[PDB]
Design a protein around this ligand. Sequence first.
Ligand SMILES: C=C(C)CCOP(=O)(O)OP(=O)(O)O
Ligand SMILES: C=C(C)CCOP(=O)(O)OP(=O)(O)O
Ligand SMILES: C=C(C)CCOP(=O)(O)OP(=O)(O)O
Ligand SMILES: [Mg+2]
Ligand SMILES: [Mg+2]
Ligand SMILES: [Mg+2]
Ligand SMILES: [Mg+2]
Ligand SMILES: [Mg+2]
Ligand SMILES: [Mg+2]
Ligand SMILES: [Mg+2]
Lengths: 328, 342
Amino acid sequence: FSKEESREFMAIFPDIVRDLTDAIPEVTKRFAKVLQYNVPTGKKTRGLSTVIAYKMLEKPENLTPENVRLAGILGWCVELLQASLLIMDDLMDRSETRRGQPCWYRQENVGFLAINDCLHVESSLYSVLRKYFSHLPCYVPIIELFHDVNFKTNMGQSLDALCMKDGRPILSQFTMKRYSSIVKYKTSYYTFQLPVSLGMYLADMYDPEQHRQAKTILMEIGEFFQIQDDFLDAFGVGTDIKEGKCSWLAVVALQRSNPAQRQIMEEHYGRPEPESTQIIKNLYIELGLPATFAVYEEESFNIIRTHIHQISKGLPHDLFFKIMKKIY
Amino acid sequence: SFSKEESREFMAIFPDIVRDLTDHTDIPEVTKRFAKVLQYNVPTGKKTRGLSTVIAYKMLEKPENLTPENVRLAGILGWCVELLQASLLIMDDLMDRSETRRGQPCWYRQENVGFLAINDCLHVESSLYSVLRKYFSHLPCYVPIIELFHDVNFKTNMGQSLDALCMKDGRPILSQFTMKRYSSIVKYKTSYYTFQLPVSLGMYLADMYDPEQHRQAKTILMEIGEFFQIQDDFLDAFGDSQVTGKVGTDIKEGKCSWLAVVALQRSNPAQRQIMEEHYGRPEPESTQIIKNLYIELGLPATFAVYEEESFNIIRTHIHQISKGLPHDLFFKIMKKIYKRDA
Ligand SMILES: C=C(C)CCOP(=O)(O)OP(=O)(O)O
Ligand SMILES: C=C(C)CCOP(=O)(O)OP(=O)(O)O
Ligand SMILES: C=C(C)CCOP(=O)(O)OP(=O)(O)O
Ligand SMILES: [Mg+2]
Ligand SMILES: [Mg+2]
Ligand SMILES: [Mg+2]
Ligand SMILES: [Mg+2]
Ligand SMILES: [Mg+2]
Ligand SMILES: [Mg+2]
Ligand SMILES: [Mg+2]
């Protein structure tokens, strides 16, 4: 997560913009604006994770400036996929802002054009893959991984939507089993599996059992990341309560609620009125969810640490500890 | 040919496509929902793109190679084009604020869909690559086919963006509504995915990779594509929604349609000022004032002359096709769409 790692990664971004525009002009001019607004925002943890994965998997003699740059181009393809997913999500959730910026669809003379922009950005990453990877053995595996992860992410987004009806949350749907499945499909595949598997393919590591071993730990890391994120939304302005999100806090609240407290969740969860958010926050404090999170965090850390030490098939343990360090 | 027999053969593959994409055993709620998404959105069209893929292959491949298995592969490729079509229409209806598609309420208008249609759009598009992986991953044509879908997808998104830049600040950019702009929109928005994609897929499955052969096909199929979209633009204003299965929104959405471009070419100053005032308005009475102007300018008659003359011009260009391309494939495509009312 160092400043020098960020600068190395950002140095590639102008080339990505040139590749997808310069390299019908009013569309290409506009698309340069789409890319610069939506793609290089946030901390770029997923793109940087792709570069770090490659650096810790590849043979030192192969870690040339050229090959490290290729890993960066792969990282930007992950950031292109994310940008597409978040443009769509912000449209679907009718959100006002993301990471301090207005949601792309809310910008002047965007509106419903954000729908095509979402698909355009997703489509663009396969142009980048063709330009830089078409001559390599990792080309087809990388293409198939992106298509597979995109499909799985759409399945996650749909499962998330099946926890809401007529603008209200369906609290009967808020089970730990459904929560775990939403996090796995909607977040963990594209956030954790995709960067590491891309690093492995670029380092010409194709053993399916290596990818399966990596997947097992990265799905556990992914679940912790999202539970910590859900916790910090309320206790870390967080809008999960107002939005009626199937968050870990809401799932555990319903597990620990008596009938009177279940009725409070029924009446007040996913309501825009200021009194509702405050009533839910008060209930979360009353149910001792911060204390419950602290216990979960310790147990999960020790289980994941143990599982990383057990990773077989000659994978570097240090890669998973560096990722797991960044989360915790 | 586009016969009942060919249609039955093609439709028979659809259940296998749904099974392949839905039957992730830890999330059965979502896999069953996706079966519904596919059943609603994919197979109730005319399926001309899908059937065109099969016909292209059958006329390009060496007769001895046309096994039941190889003809079914062409059919599966056809359904991959129909999956792309399905995803584009889901997204398009949301963007074009449309009421009906293929005789039914648009997917996004279904009670608890709305903007979730954007996710279903991305999902259906992604799904075609799973189908390609299952059936084509072991064949030499796999990477060319993947790269064609990728490139056509990208080009179509570019076309849809140029189509959507018809308006800024709620008013149409009528000064920019030229036949040059129109030809650019339709080439990227329609021609590549509707005509080039099916034929190129047929060529690739028949292991025909000669770039000159693809370039020869491209030249004619871009002409056929423009013709097809001009027909679609006409049906938007003057078609029967009971036959087309859709309600037109081009006037209301201020689209750079063939009708709008030709109307501005034929308009006197007073008629130009009616377009300036009433084109691209949400009010229904403004849509009627534009349709009235189209009628007064004789655009129905102008369209009929264009369609007949273009049919003859394209048929003349098909006769001049070289590079061992079967002329009859292109005649069959033009015969299928000439004077269509849907
Ligand atoms: C990858 C996708 C689809 C983003 C989902 O984010 P959520 O809607 O759950 O939460 P926000 O990041 O919008 O707060
Ligand atoms: C490119 C355009 C005009 C979209 C509709 O295509 P069709 O008119 O072929 O639609 P379906 O048969 O698939 O319903
Ligand atoms: C990329 C696509 C789907 C082309 C749609 O063009 P239109 O917007 O004119 O299509 P219809 O709604 O008339 O079917
Ligand atoms: Mg959201
Ligand atoms: Mg969401
Ligand atoms: Mg959050
Ligand atoms: Mg948010
Ligand atoms: Mg439309
Ligand atoms: Mg449209
Ligand atoms: Mg139309």
